[PDB]
Specification:
Bound molecules: a molecule of 3 linked components (NAG-NAG-BMA), a molecule of 2 linked components (NAG-NAG)
CATH class of the largest domain in chain B: Alpha Beta
Order of helices and strands of chain A: HEEHHEEHH
Keywords: glycoprotein, membrane-fusion precursor, viral protein
CATH topology of the largest domain in chain B: Hemagglutinin (Ha1 Chain), Chain: A, domain 1
Chains A, D, F: hemagglutinin
Distance between the termini of chain A: 38 Å
PDB class: viral protein
CATH architecture of chain A: Alpha-Beta Complex
Helix content of chain A: 55-70%
Helix content of chain B: under 10%
Order of helices and strands of chain B: EEEEEEEHEEHEEEEHEEEEEEEEEEEEE
Distance between the termini of chain B: 30 Å
Assembly: hexameric
Number of helices of chain B: 3
Number of strands of chain A: 4
Radius of gyration of chain B: 29 Å
Oligomer: heterohexamer
Strand content of chain B: 25-35%
Radius of gyration of chain A: 27 Å
Shape of chain A: rod-shaped
Shape of chain B: elongated
Entry title: Crystal Structure of a H5N1 influenza virus hemagglutinin.
């Protein structure tokens, strides 16, 4: 994975999560658990489905055609037709195969991208009120609960609230 | 302190996918783009049945080959199905002129109906009921094509035939006739009195004169004579005139025909299955949605592009690796 | 404190664009890749005019159909334009041999010039000025093709014609001739004395012998006779020899021809508009730059690939959403 | 947008900017304003134009061709030609449509990429002499003026200059 | 303090590459995708030699043109190579029926062997060794095709020939025969007594009757007579029967033939170079691996797709800019 | 380069490195030098080779075909064939050209991506035990040697070891 996501900092994806495609895993003082992210997962499903569809729907030109029809004093023409059929087979076969190859690649990168997006959204929402572990994980400078992590998913985490609780807790670890 | 960790989905999937840069990549969800399922029967194209000649060539069918039947009283069709090597063709050996082009013309028909053009009993001064051979055995009794008459001399005379038919129908009509090319001079005289002989047929289009070609040939179904056939479309208001001195195989029946589109002749050993598709295949119909298939190249209909591969598998989910 | 913020452009654009993963995406700037504009006229291809036969078939034009003209004294052309159903074809009913091939050969011509090969008055011992019919009415007076002569018996005699022409020009020359197939034996004798007849034509290439085919046919423009026509290219130093006993429709004019490239016959009801393109369409010319168009499949020229869609709209700017 | 740019931290793009495609928006003690970036915007225009052109210019193979020509006893051949024409229409139609779809996607990601580039260039030029807001915005630990932000665009921002003004101003906010 | 810096490779490469968005980009390593190299000789296809006719057309070869030879005693071949304008074709001017089709049939042959079908000396009651002309000069002495016999009257008589050959081999066999179309009636009587004449050939398939066509033609190689040739495949158990009254150019030799696949006739002025490929070109063989070439459109074999460009250069390394 | 790598923070790539495609350049108290990274460089070679190959191997449909065969009374058919040959030439020529253009782009971005991956792997492995210069370079808050940088490449750098050596060394520079 190109974006440091799958082959990178997040080694392995949680099987414990059925909710969606992307998500969180908390370990607060109540317990621990994983609830998937929705706007992200939803926008992805949309995207992938769409890709599949357009790949199908954009051919929606094909129309009536047929099989084969010359006698054996018309062999030159039979050959003419062969060539043409053969030539189309070579075109379609080659395109289809490479289309899939190329688009498969873009797909797996598209996922990596979103993961890193989600990682960076969390990261920015809470600058130095949290520690960057490197496992794709964040440790809070302060204490936190279940209702606490709702705003974290929401995008309504308030920095100036737990800042001085972190700030003093930061110097305590220093030296 | 307290944590939140961002992660991605993973399930018990083992479906692999390929990438421009990577092979055998395990994935969460995947979608096959390539159709591989057919249903192994022949079906209507857009609710219009095919014409399935079982053991008969089109020639065999059009001419009345005794072993074929005229039971093909199906008024309309979307495509024709011949077997690889139909058993019933020209029982009497011979040739059919522009046969392929006629086949193609017939491949798809809007309306088709058999009309008695020149009735078998109107040959008062020629023999109508004798032109019969062991090459076309009907029920042990020897016989001959039903839709066409092989006229022979009455007494020891073959008056010059002058005869025509006006197409007073609205439909184009397909008409057929033949020459007999005997084996030798004696055979000539025996069947028709006259040694020198012609058939001439005229339309507003057609302007032909046939002359029998006498020659030692090899026996085929025991026959060293030969039958050559010919056809045209007689336009609504037109008229066809025949004139013969005699090696004439006269039409008896012809076909009204309304043509509103083309298709092709399919070769298949399959049988009809009551059933419909938008796309058919000598190995069976395809209920298509995918833009590609790998079933068979010789299709008829609105089909996915035929391709050479087993896998066109597109990644839906993500890198689901244990 | 003090700020800097990074942002992107946005304007009052409402032009949408599609993406592999997204539909109806509003964009800042966009570029249409698909040509949709034509000019509704017929134009020169690379500064060479087309040949626009108005109400004439090519046959009509080449033979002198009285209602067509020889005013097509245009020496050169890049493609030919026939109507869907030209009104003036073979006034006298008949057939033209290898017509399509001839049409194709003539579709684009570097030089074309009409030459009096065998002058209408050099038939001293045959009737040149009588072969005329009401099927080809000129100005109320009945008549016949201008570029070809219908020879009739003089007194009650038709001497065997022996006659040839050496192509001493440097250009290839296209030559035409025909047979009359009368309706019946009486009609034969009436026009030509001799009952049995032939035309034979020889080249360094051509080696033909025609024989009129007598038969009752249906009247067409009141005529149950038929005219059958034939052509060749007579090579620079070669010579064509005609010999007939009589059903001969003699050339009078033939065409010097220099062929340096092919094209096709276009079917259109449009008229010339003084004008030039590198790409033409039965609905009009295209001043192309786009690699795709959706105007019409039957083009002539250097054209954008014809495509089945309305929108090939490529994203220039970015996500301009209100 | 994949790179956390358009659909990410920078919600909405400034219409107030006509200068270019990408740019800045200051709010210093003089006033505020937006002057677009030039090497970036320029390299983009070049790139997009180039993409459009090559899409046009690489077909520069086409050449002379034509319409339709067989009599009704050559119907099998007429059919042969139909199929061929038809088949080419199916090829071109499919390719063109998907080409556009794929390249449109890569275009919109190309923009996102550049935005993030620009964001990250600014970010690195001034490590902890500035605060990372998360709106795609930076707040200065020190005071700044108009001539001050020229070097910011230039790429000539001097870190060791305003470091100790930030460093002390940083501890003042701490606890 | 102490540093670590991340960087990328750079070397002394100046090979440029193009990008959707960028031109003339300097790169570390690159790979050409487009084949441009051929070896300028003609080679076996998959270890099967071509048949290289040097100065002979196929016709020239098959009929025995005196200047060609029968030295083409190679049993098997994969494709044929004629020159643009072979010098030795039909020494005696004439025509060859379905020539191209026969050329196509012969383009690739599994086995081919020349067999004496009707010996030149078994013509007891006709003249076999006189049919000779200055149009086919052999060594100053005038002469005629080797593989075929031009029978002339003996005494002042040409009995009707009746004659047949059973193909008792297992192989199909290709058989050839001709008509002579004399210049005039006198020439007729001189060579063959009888004024009215025919050749008729019959198979289980073939049913022909030729009739010489007399006409003044232009001299070609000094001859205004013409030779018209014809052919068939005579099936293993079948038999061909000839009957003529006389303008008959009788087979002497015919060809055992085993056909297991098709190819084409290539036009090249090159000569054999002992050598093998899977893909051949009139300018030379290609040892292909690339998926594209730009050498020549008229290939034979399993070839890279032919493309119109000089550069298909793919980026291996990275942006190596000074 | 799109990922801030080549056209971005790392201006120019080290020619001094022959080892691989990507790597490091230390300047510790012993001396200085560059040893390339291996899993990264190896995964790239694999990927590029693979792309080249599949571009070749996916055409592995082509088969027997031929040259040209009608007499000059079959000119309409010769034309038919010309068109067809011509049309295939236009398709293959266009596809091949754009295929190359597109994939070349994705290749050069693929490299940029990996560079940034490598940059970010190092970066995260050692949060505030190092300074982010912006040249694509990191300066250590502590002293370091040759054996020291092995774990850095390894991915076995220990943060809590040199943390308080950095932490005190960090405040010394502050004000
Ligand atoms: C095939 O038979 C039909 C019979 O319907 C022929 O059509 C008819 O042709 C005759 C001429 O032969 C037409 O009669 C004409 O009518 C006008 C007045 O309306 C009269 O003044 C003339 O004396 C003239 O004879 C008639 O219109 C026409 N009927 C129809 C239904 O079209 C047809 O001609 C025959 N085919 C041929 C060419 O033999
Ligand atoms: C159509 O007429 C032309 C011109 O009259 C014929 O070609 C001419 O034939 C003459 C005499 O036969 C040729 O001259 C010859 O030239 C060769 C050398 O090239 C020489 O060895 C001979 O002895 C002879 O003189 C020449 O091609 C041409 N005459 C001139 C002066 O141009 C042509 O034969 C006629 N068409 C046919 C097929 O009858
Ligand atoms: C050509 O001769 C062959 C070879 O003898 C003939 O084939 C035999 O003919 C008899 C007579 O009908 C049949 O029993 C078989 O077809 C063949 N027998 C064997 C052992 O081959 C063949 O009939 C001849 N062909 C013609 C047209 O007469
Ligand atoms: C990637 O995985 C596929 C899984 O199908 C491999 O497919 C096998 O192909 C071999 C040929 O060597 C066959 O013998 C097997 O039947 C297939 N495996 C099974 C049982 O699934 C494929 O070879 C792999 N690609 C490579 C070469 O790595
Ligand atoms: C996506 O946007 C286009 C806008 O062009 C939609 O096309 C609509 O089609 C109607 C006709 O029924 C046009 O009058 C309008 O331009 C469009 N409708 C409206 C109300 O915008 C298209 O249908 C839209 N959505 C999709 C993807 O189906
Ligand atoms: C970038 O690509 C090619 C290859 O170097 C350039 O082709 C050159 O054309 C110009 C003059 O028109 C000269 O600089 C060189 O002499 C040519 N090079 C060749 C083909 O040897 C191309 O022009 C370059 N960029 C541009 C637009 O100048």
């Amino acid at each position: 994975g190109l974006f440091g996501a799958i082959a990178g900092f997040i080694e392995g994806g949680w099987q414990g999560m059925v909710d969606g495609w992307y998500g969180y895993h908390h370990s607060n003082e109540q317990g621990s658990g994983y609830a998937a992210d929705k706007e992200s997962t939803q926008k992805a499903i949309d995207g992938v489905t769409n890709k599949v569809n357009s790949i199908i729907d954009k051919m929606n030109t094909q129309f009536e055609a047929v099989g084969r029809e010359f006698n054996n004093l018309e062999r030159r023409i039979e050959n003419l037709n062969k060539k043409m059929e053969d030539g189309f087979l070579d075109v379609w076969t080659y395109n289809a195969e490479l289309l899939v190859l190329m688009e498969n690649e873009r797909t797996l990168d598209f996922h990596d991208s979103n993961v890193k997006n989600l990682y960076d959204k969390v990261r920015l929402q809470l600058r130095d009120n949290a520690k960057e572990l490197g496992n794709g994980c964040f440790e809070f400078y302060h204490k936190c609960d279940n209702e606490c992590m709702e705003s974290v998913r929401n995008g309504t985490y308030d920095y100036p609230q737990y800042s001085e609780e972190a700030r003093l807790k930061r110097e305590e670890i220093s030296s | 302190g307290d944590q939140i960790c961002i992660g991605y989905h993973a399930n018990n999937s083992t479906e692999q996918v390929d990438t421009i840069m990577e092979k055998n990549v395990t994935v969460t969800h995947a979608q096959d783009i390539l159709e591989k399922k057919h249903n192994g029967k022949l079906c209507d194209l857009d609710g219009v049945k095919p014409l399935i000649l079982r053991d008969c060539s089109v020639a065999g069918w059009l001419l009345g080959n005794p072993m074929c039947d005229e039971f093909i009283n199906v008024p309309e069709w979307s495509y024709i199905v011949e077997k690889a090597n139909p058993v019933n063709d020209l029982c009497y050996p011979g040739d059919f002129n522009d046969y392929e082009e006629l086949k193609h013309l017939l491949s798809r028909i809007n309306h088709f109906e058999k009309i008695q053009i020149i009735p078998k009993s109107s040959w008062s001064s020629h023999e109508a009921s004798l032109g019969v051979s062991s090459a076309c055995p009907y029920q042990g009794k020897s016989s001959f094509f039903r839709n066409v008459v092989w006229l022979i001399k009455k007494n020891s005379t073959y008056p010059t035939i002058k005869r025509s038919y006006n197409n007073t129908n609205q439909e184009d009509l397909l008409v057929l006739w033949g020459i007999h090319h005997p084996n030798d001079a004696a055979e000539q005289t025996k069947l028709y009195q006259n040694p020198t002989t012609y058939i001439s047929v005229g339309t507003s289009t057609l302007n032909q004169r046939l002359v029998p070609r006498i020659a030692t040939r090899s026996k085929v179904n025991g026959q060293s004579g030969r039958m050559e056939f010919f056809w045209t479309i007689l336009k609504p208001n037109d008229a066809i005139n025949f004139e013969s001195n005699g090696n004439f195989i006269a039409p008896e029946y012809a076909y009204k025909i309304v043509k509103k589109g083309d298709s092709t002749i399919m070769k298949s050993e399959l049988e009809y299955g009551n059933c419909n598709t938008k796309c058919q295949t000598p190995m069976g119909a395809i209920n298509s949605s995918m833009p590609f298939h790998n079933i068979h190249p010789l299709t008829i209909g609105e089909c996915p592009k035929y391709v050479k591969s087993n896998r066109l598998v597109l990644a839906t989910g993500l890198r689901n690796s244990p």
